[PDB]
Amino acid sequence: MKLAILGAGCYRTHAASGITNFSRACEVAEMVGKPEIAMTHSTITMGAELKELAGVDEVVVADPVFDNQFTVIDDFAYEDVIEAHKEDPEKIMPQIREKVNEVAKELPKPPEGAIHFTHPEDLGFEITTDDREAVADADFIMTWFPKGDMQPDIINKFIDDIKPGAIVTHACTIPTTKFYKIFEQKHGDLVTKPETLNVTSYHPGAVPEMKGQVYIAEGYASEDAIETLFELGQKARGNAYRLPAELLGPVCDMCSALTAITYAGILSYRDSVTQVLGAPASFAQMMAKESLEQITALMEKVGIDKMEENLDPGALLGTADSMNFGASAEILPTVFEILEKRKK
Amino acid sequence: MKLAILGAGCYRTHAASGITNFSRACEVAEMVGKPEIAMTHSTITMGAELKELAGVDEVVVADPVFDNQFTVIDDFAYEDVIEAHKEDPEKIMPQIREKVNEVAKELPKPPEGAIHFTHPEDLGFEITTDDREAVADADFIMTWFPKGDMQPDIINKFIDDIKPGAIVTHACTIPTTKFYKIFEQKHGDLVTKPETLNVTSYHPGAVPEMKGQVYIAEGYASEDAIETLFELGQKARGNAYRLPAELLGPVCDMCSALTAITYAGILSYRDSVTQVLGAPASFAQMMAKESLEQITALMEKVGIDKMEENLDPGALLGTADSMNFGASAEILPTVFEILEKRKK
Amino acid sequence: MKLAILGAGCYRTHAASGITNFSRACEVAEMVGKPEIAMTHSTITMGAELKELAGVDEVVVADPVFDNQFTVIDDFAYEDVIEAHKEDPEKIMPQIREKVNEVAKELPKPPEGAIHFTHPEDLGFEITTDDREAVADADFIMTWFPKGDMQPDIINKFIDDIKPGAIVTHACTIPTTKFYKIFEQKHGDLVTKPETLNVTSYHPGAVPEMKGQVYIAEGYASEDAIETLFELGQKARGNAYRLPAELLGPVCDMCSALTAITYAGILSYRDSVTQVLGAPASFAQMMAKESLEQITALMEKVGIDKMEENLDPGALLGTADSMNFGASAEILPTVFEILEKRKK
Amino acid sequence: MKLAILGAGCYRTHAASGITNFSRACEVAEMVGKPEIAMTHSTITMGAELKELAGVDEVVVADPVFDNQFTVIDDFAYEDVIEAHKEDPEKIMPQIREKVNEVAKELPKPPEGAIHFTHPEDLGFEITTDDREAVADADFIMTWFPKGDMQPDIINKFIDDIKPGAIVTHACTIPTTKFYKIFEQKHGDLVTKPETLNVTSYHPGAVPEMKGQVYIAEGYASEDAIETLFELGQKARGNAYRLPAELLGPVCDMCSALTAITYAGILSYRDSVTQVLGAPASFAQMMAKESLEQITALMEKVGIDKMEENLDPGALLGTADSMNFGASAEILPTVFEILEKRKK
Amino acid sequence: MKLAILGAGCYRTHAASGITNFSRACEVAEMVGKPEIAMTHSTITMGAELKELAGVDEVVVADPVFDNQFTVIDDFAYEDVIEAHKEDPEKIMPQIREKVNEVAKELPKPPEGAIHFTHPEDLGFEITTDDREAVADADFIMTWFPKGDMQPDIINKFIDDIKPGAIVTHACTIPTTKFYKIFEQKHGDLVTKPETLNVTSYHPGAVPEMKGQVYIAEGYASEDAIETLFELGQKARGNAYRLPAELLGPVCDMCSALTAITYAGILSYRDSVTQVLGAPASFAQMMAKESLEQITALMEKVGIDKMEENLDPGALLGTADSMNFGASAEILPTVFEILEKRKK
């Protein structure tokens, strides 16, 4: 198949964050014996994986930046980075960040400037400034566009050139629904033919060069399209996750921590009710729904910063302790230390 | 297993309707060589099926009416009814209705009176006036209670006597949700133990003696409980249907016709979009959702009797004709004759 | 009155669709003895109708394309097309499509290029590149803008130049609500004066040159404005439909087929309940609401492509058959063939 | 036609209120030359009006109280009350209240006791203890039942005896929707035939003997049924109002004052926007919707007693003053005195 | 602290409205002995107040217009305007409007043209064309941007240059929620750091030079940030109002009149119920909620222009009169004159 990456991306924001590395990129480079992969970042790493590990036959990277100031840093040798990542990334990352940060002081933001460490061409990739040429014959188009009102306009330029049934994906810069609306149009006429694209996501849930993982939004694409991408991503990224499009944010955004906590609570609570009390899962759900809707409603009603003034954390210590059995007992003791500490 | 039927029911309303027969009851009676089944009705027929065809070991029929005026009509011989149903039920049904209607003129309504044609005892069934005794050791309790505020009070008397994990079912007299709330309680304390019952439905979707079919509401019971009842009902009734509890009304109530029409429309429309246009099913759903929500909203906004004044049926002839392809072409020509006839 | 058409449109997409003709445009041309109308398309046809058949005194066509590559094809004589449309449009349409398609291969998309067959000037129309000049003194402004984020920006340039109380319309490229928000502003101050425009639609529900019909969205404009346009459109297009703004999509979009089916179902079902059962229309509505809300909810809950796994089409055959009377009997037999074919 | 009143009612609560009179009852009695009408109350007055002024041929009053302690007070002569009401009801009402209050100290509440001043029989009415006998052949059934869970059970006893198409009404003791559900049933089967009744209201919006007015809930009954009752009530009560069932509470309950204020505001505000600003009524509605939804949301969010802490009444004086023109200027000056007085 | 005003604004629309003056600007100028303030307008007045009366140390005005045609009118002497505003603004405002209107005939709209009367530099302000330079080190950024899709793009250029914890405000051109979304981003990754800004409003609720008042939207910023701005605005504008972000529109938009009316109604109605009837405020709220939701629902259901056809204004006169006591009696008599006049 033909993969058309639209957006090479820039490492400035990764280096600026001060908390990333090339652990995955390195791991891949060592697996396939191509040192140049070690310092690839963003879609280049993901493209590297799909070509080298998933068997994607043709890769094309499209980005206006290639004609603009596409900056490649040759200061760090690939092998040094690989060997440093083998024991402790921090033996070379602070040095890497300062150079990127220095380059980024004057360098314009994308698409006028991009900080990379590997030339896509070296990975056998075809580079292009124009997106239409890239999407031509592409079975899988991977978008890595900027956050903003430009994604619909960026897309409209190559939408007619998209092959029927192609898998089109988005990443952390845009919600699935919003992205899907650009391609599929509700209002029209007999003349305007609906698109037939399989819209999904190829969301890293982190900087692709640091972690090997992908999140694939379900609900807009054919199941075959989801299976095809799921199988590609499982091979390319190592850890692929299929999930409803509505949960992509909850799981990949800064709220991930609360979704995690809450989900553990729900699953634990449910199991204590079905396995210890023996009640049907429908009773556990009715109870769960009560908790969730009300505590969320309270946070909306008075504000997340005024909950304690309305519901003292201590009020739950006197009642929840009786439900401390089954799976819930794996999480309640911790939860109680937190409410003990916050009680009025 | 032990089956505890709570409510024998009465044939007055069936005879009064003027449109029912004993076709199923007859079909069963002939299958098992027990003529007495031919004129059984309501739960007696269903119990007859479960004992004779599903292998239910113990059947108990509980109804206060047994101590009251439980009337059995011996005017029609079982074989005559069977032979009449073999070619045309109407050769004996008009005669049957008049006798039931005559008996029903003075006879009190249940639980003070009940019109039957077969003595449950003859089918090997245990009869009881008290429900607690009946539900004792019952693996499957089949409720056939009257429509009204009495179902919670009728139930509260034997709820503590219900065996853990028992399958409790309801029929056309009450919605699943409403019925489920009687057993499972949201508000309580450590002292009040939640019930562990598998609440579902054993809804005939007609008078049990006329049609062999059952509707089993999903979402409140364990999947095992649904499978067990599904397998019993498939054997006992012949045609069993598993469906979400929310659709039990839509499918079994007087609205069945509109659900049917609409569902065919949705499935046809979807197929024309996925198979002819090639668009993803998500696009078909987005379009469908548009139609359904808006036409329903219009009916609510101006009233089902004032739609034509606001949306002329003719307005759709000029636009829908272009979508007349694929599966939709099996239903649009008919649909067009109806809008042609109703256009302003 | 003065009509200001903003957007001449382009025939490429019509020709590309492979399913359109000039039947209406021809019919008009023959009615008014002006052959040039036969090959007009989009707003030119509609403007032709309003000037020639509705008595609109002054027509102005505004489009940046006139200064750009506005391409007119002189390959087909008007009379040939008229005579061909008199018996079978397909005797000349395939030939017409290939030429348009060939012209459209290199020609840029609007507003840089437009494929027409008649010079607006020949119809007595005033052509302009600038919209402000066009809307000046316009009693009726007919927008035919592109689908996208540009409509608000296109509009803002001439909004102050719009005459108070003018009728402003939109077509298939934008929803009424969205379009209305561009003109009328909710947030402001004493200084910002609310607009007084009569926002509606002049939606062809097809390519204007093929069908004579218009859809006029109600709810945003004065009733006088709706009556004025309704009377113009009835004369100009032949078949004008007044309808709530919320139904414009449902009726004119690809969902038209399902709205049609559903509406017939509702009207048929209602009539069987009020005319055969005698129940009040309020009972029919309560039942209808049950059907619609639940079947729509099911499609949303599990997905339009997974309904059968949850509600077997066959489940409705056993129940709906009893409601097969009255108006509903005109649609149920067909509906049953569809569910018979799809039953699990 | 035949009118079946179900519930005679009791005057204790009227006398206890300390604020009622017999002004209407008196006015009727004088109009028809029947002094006995002067001291009738509740449904007896309304029945008196329908028989004497609307031409209702047969009146039947059904109430279990007739067999129980139905108390009639002969202490006040009809003519004295009429003459007293001719100039000032308070010349005899305080005396009337004390006697009723004294009688009501020991007398049981209905249906065991009822305080009246006129024997229904004297008005030519047929009195009955049993409701089934009363509703037989009744074209118009007027329910005057107690507030509570008993209305469905009271109704179920005579529902089968109700004539098809009969007009069934309720008063201040029950909401229309709730009342309608008792008669019309959503869940059933082919056997259970839907009711065909025309459910509405004959709501006095006060004690019938004090004011001549009726409120008739629309949306559940046939338009003919509403017209028939509207025409009866206009003749019988003098001031009849047809209105959507949803507004019966808003208009007749203690909230009437706020509905009144608000409605005047909406109508005034709308007129200033359409008549002075010239904006379309759709703009006035968009603005109105903003106001109403938000101020209501604020009251729900913080509580009606904490609004000032969140939105100072004074905040609106600085902004609303600019909108003080047109119809709104009839209500804003007053409204400003109230906000001036309440500003923080 | 450092104040960075982004947008100087233009007086054309103020002069065009025909209903504004410089009363506040004058009042300030006289208070601080700086005549030049008298004819300042928009943010210049507000900046003048914050520097002169609130003690803001550094003011910066950023606007692309300064490099473009920034027009200053020297035709009216400051003192003449001050003396004219001392007794009657209309002795000089008509003359001022005509000159501004004449200048505005050819002058381009902002940011290409701006009509002012005082050079910001004279007030000690730093003027700049570039926003990034202005926001640098700004503790309080005051946005005065145009209404439209440009605010997010205008903002994105200086967002990274914004100091952590800065107070960012918007005015009548944009809703708080919409404005807040530009800065705070829900979707992202570990790399994209959430903003830490205190988003609020500095909404004049009129032209700043006419009235001394500000509205500060609560719910998005820290309470400290709201207190800081509240205290600045109270000193600078004289009348500052803290209110939930949801009410900013309701209170400052053209709907202000209806919010005012309604709010007075709610507060009056509540007080009659709690103070006269003695019922709890929860009962008043339940009643209020009934009124508001239903009357709003009716306006949505049939349209603000068709309410009378469905609910006759007269219907409330017969019922509300009984609730005419307590605080409500301050508003009901007026309200009754309006319903008397509009009754069918």
Swiss-Prot record, chains A, B, C, D, E:
Claim: DNA damage is one of the keywords in the record: no
InterPro entries named among the record's database cross-references: 6-PGluconate_DH-like_C_sf, HMD, HMD_C, HMD_C_sf, HMD_N, METHMP_Hmd, NAD(P)-bd_dom_sf
EC number from the UniProt entry: 1.12.98.2
Pfam families per the UniProt record, alphabetical: HMD, HMD_N
Enzyme class of the recorded protein, top EC level: oxidoreductase
Tree of life domain: Archaea
Pathway info: One-carbon metabolism; methanogenesis from CO(2); 5,10-methylene-5,6,7,8-tetrahydromethanopterin from 5,10-methenyl-5,6,7,8-tetrahydromethanopterin (hydrogen route): step 1/1
Keyword flag Oxidoreductase: yes
Biophysicochemical property: temperature dependence: Optimum temperature is 60 degrees Celsius.
Subunit and partners: Homotetramer.
Function: Catalyzes the reversible reduction of methenyl-H(4)MPT(+) to methylene-H(4)MPT.
NCBIfam families named in the record: hmd_TIGR (TIGR01723)
Identification of the protein by name: 5,10-methenyltetrahydromethanopterin hydrogenase
Species this protein is from: Methanothermobacter marburgensis (strain ATCC BAA-927 / DSM 2133 / JCM 14651 / NBRC 100331 / OCM 82 / Marburg)
